[PDB]
């Protein structure tokens, strides 16, 4: 179990008796591998035309991401929404089909640990509609480092309706790959995060893809404690109570603090 769970102050919630029970988290990724004896995947769907099994993860990232959500929120219910194939890529339309599935099946949180440097009007429409319907929508900010003074935040994280999550190491320092820009909302651990992998394995991965599910899991913790808070309120609590790491272009509001976010 990874360093990141303590770093975001998730244990305070666990101690109070809030572990994410009855909160449905959709992991929009490459599937979630059934090789794990405890992810408690409650269902799912695939929108990758040539890979119809959402419980087979031929990439590894979906399973790792799911595991981080659960580390954070151990009683949450995960849904495997396979919108990326084995090579880790997916068409805009497959992702939109994933988002729409999550809306139709009343998911509480969407995690999207995926990006592209340019956007799609239809994908903006999908995330916007999800947030409109009350879903907390979280995405990895991107792994494009710096490019002068320009934003390198990827889409869909770059859309206003979506929480954009950058990556810090265990010392709270921004990872050199972490995207930058005014669109960054918060940071979470994303360097050598240990989590579940295919083939019943367990190992480290790095990226804003590992940071995002810390936030998705935090949202699940908050909603288990506070079922009456709206998505807007969950999002504001995470952003407004973050530990400032000084410097919004690089860190947004700073490091999430689930203990502070939840009252």
């Amino acid at each position: 179990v990874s360093y990141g769970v303590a770093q975001i102050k998730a244990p305070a919630l666990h101690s109070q008796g809030y572990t994410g029970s009855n909160v449905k988290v959709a992991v929009l990724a490459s599937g979630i591998d059934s090789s794990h004896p405890d992810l408690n995947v409650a269902g799912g769907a695939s929108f990758v035309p040539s890979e119809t099994n959402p419980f087979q993860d031929n990439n590894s990232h979906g399973t790792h991401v799911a595991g981080t959500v659960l580390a954070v929120a151990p009683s949450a219910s995960l849904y495997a929404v396979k919108v990326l194939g084995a090579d880790g890529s997916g068409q805009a339309s497959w992702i939109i089909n994933g988002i729409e599935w999550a809306i139709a099946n009343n998911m509480d949180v969407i995690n999207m640990s995926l990006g592209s440097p340019s956007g799609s009007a239809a994908l903006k429409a999908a995330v916007d509609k999800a947030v409109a319907s009350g879903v907390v929508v979280v995405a990895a900010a991107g792994n494009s480092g710096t490019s002068g003074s320009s934003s390198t935040v990827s889409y869909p994280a770059k859309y206003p309706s979506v929480i954009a999550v950058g990556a810090v190491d265990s010392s709270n320092q921004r990872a050199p790959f972490s995207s930058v820009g005014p669109e960054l909302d918060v940071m979470a651990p994303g360097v050598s995060i240990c989590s579940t992998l295919p083939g019943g394995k367990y190992g480290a991965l790095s990226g804003t893809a590992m940071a995002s599910p810390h936030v998705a899991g935090a949202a699940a913790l908050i909603l288990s404690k506070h079922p009456n808070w709206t998505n807007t309120q969950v999002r504001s609590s995470l952003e407004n109570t973050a530990t400032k790491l000084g410097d919004s272009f690089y860190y947004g509001k700073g490091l999430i603090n689930v203990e502070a976010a939840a009252q």
């Binding site: 990724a29 490459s30 990439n59 990232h61 790792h64 991401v65 990326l84 880790g88 890529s89 997916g90 068409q91 805009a92 339309s93 992702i95 939109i96 089909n97 729409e100 809306i103 139709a104 640990s113 995926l114 990006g115 592209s116 340019s118 799609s120 009007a121 239809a122 994908l123 429409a125 999908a126 509609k129 990895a140 991107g142 792994n143 990827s154 889409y155 869909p156 790959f177 991965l205 790095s206 990226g207 804003t208 893809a209 590992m210 995002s212």
Partner: protein, 71 residues
């Protein structure tokens, strides 16, 4: 290349209505979205041009790839 998403103005909610517009311009419907006022389709360049100019259509954009942000 050739995979696109065709977005629609008001009054084209059912998949049948979207599909008919895409079909009339020589495109091949792939999927109609439920909430988003759009559909994926495969289109040659003439179909893209004709759909873009069709009063029913809000936009035609590439169905571009997004990727896992993990190493």
């Amino acid at each position: 290349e050739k995979k696109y998403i065709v977005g629609f103005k008001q009054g084209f909610k059912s998949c049948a209505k979207k599909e008919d517009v895409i079909s009339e311009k020589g495109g091949k419907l792939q999927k109609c979205f439920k909430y988003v006022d759009a559909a994926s389709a495969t289109l040659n360049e003439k179909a893209v041009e004709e759909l873009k100019k069709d009063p029913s259509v809000a936009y035609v954009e590439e169905d571009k790839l997004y990727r896992a942000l993990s190493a």
